[model samples]
Target: KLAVAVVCSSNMNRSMEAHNFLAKKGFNVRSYGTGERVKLPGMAFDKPNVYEFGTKYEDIYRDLESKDKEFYTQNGLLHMLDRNRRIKKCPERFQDTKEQFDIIVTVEERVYDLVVMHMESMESVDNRPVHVLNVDVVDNAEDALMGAFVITDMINMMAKSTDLDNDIDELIQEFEERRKRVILHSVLFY
Candidate 1:
């Protein structure tokens, strides 16, 4: 299986959604957030605010519950926290995980930029065979589900190709094109 990392601004939704989906497909996948402070709209009724990555989803859940228990359900905070905690692990920051990943899948352009810059800053004299790609999606559960499916498709394509080790750049390039093409249609939902 390919060691893959799916990243977004916050690991609560988009990237986590992909992480679960890809894991079900038997791919080695992990999720990450590419922000200084993780921001989740699921925490408040007013707007999304900053959160810490290693913070327990349970503590955040309780904190939000104490602040505005009613708003938790009203603003989707409880459901969101419930889903997040069920993943049963802390949401990781991208900079902490890339040395283990062969491919880094960024969920948006800004995240792609963040990953590239962060990776560059942490570099030494080693050339890691990591390829970063941007696959944009709106920041909602529906859009996240769609993005996850497409990422899974691309991974499947990469694994099943011939001479992938010798020509993986073209393999990645062709898969990126395929990703764009698939985004316009509903072919990969099943």
Candidate 2:
């Protein structure tokens, strides 16, 4: 199986959606965020609740439930947290993880750039190549669900390839032609 990683800004919505979808399909997948801290929606758009990157989803859910179950429930934060806690113990920071993957799919361009930059800084211990891809998913619940399908489709295509390093360009082009959206990709060694 191809070892895959999904990334987004916060690791809460976009990445987790794909992570759960891929995991359900039995793909060897992991999800991560590129943010300094884990952030969830608060009452106002400007007032985001922040926590350390490694904070458990269980703790955040309990905290929000205690603060005001009505508000969090209405805003759908509690629901998102419930889904998250079942997927993984907590949101993980991409830069902090020591594990490597055959492919890294990012939900946005900024996170894609950050992953590339971080990969470039690390020592290329074994010179193993990884495909870093970006799918430009909107940071919303509905959009994340759609993005998961797109990401899963792309990974499935790659998994079917006999030679991913040689076949990626063709696979991406085929995907773009069908989906009518450009996918950004880069190759880095780890």
Candidate 3:
């Protein structure tokens, strides 16, 4: 099985959602955050709730539950955290870990850049190769859901056809064909 990692701004959302989606589909996958610190902005004015890797979802839930029960309940932060814990032990930081993935998919261009910079450091040291692809997905449930479908299909195509060891360019081409590049307030051809 191919090892995959999904990356986004915060591990609490997009990448976590994608990780769970692919895990359910029998793919080996993990998720990580590129942010220097994890932030949970469920409530508008709650001190910019921030935490780090290995922080328990249950702990966050209870803390938020006590702090702003109504806000979390209405915003579905509680529900999101519950689903997040079910998929993994806790969120991870990409820059802080050395676990290698065959493929790393980033939901945003900035994340893609960050992950690539990290990978470049590794490649120069050990010569181990990792494929990094960017899927210009927004940081929201609906956009993440849409990205999941797109990424799952893209991975399926690669798993069946391209060999990670043989043709990186082939997979690159395939990814380009499938990835919907993000645009800000622009009309889509589709």
lDDT of each: 0.72, 0.92, 0.75
Please say which candidate is ahead in lDDT: 1 or 3: 3
Task: For candidate 3, write residues 81-112 as lDDT tens digits.
Answer: 99987877877888888677777888888787
**Tens-digit per-residue lDDT, 1-190, candidate 2:** 9899999988999999999999999999999999999888887879889998988999999999999889988878899899999989999999999899989999999899999999988686598889999999999898988999999998988888888898798899999999999799998989
The candidate, 2 or 3, that scores higher on lDDT is: 2
Query: Model 2 Cα RMSD, Å?
Result: 0.8
Best-first order by lDDT? 2, 3, 1
* TM-score on alpha carbons, each prediction: 0.81, 0.97, 0.85
lDDT for model 1 comes to 0.72
| Rank by TM-score (best first) | 2, 3, 1
Compared with the true structure, the alpha-carbon lDDT of candidate 3 equals 0.75
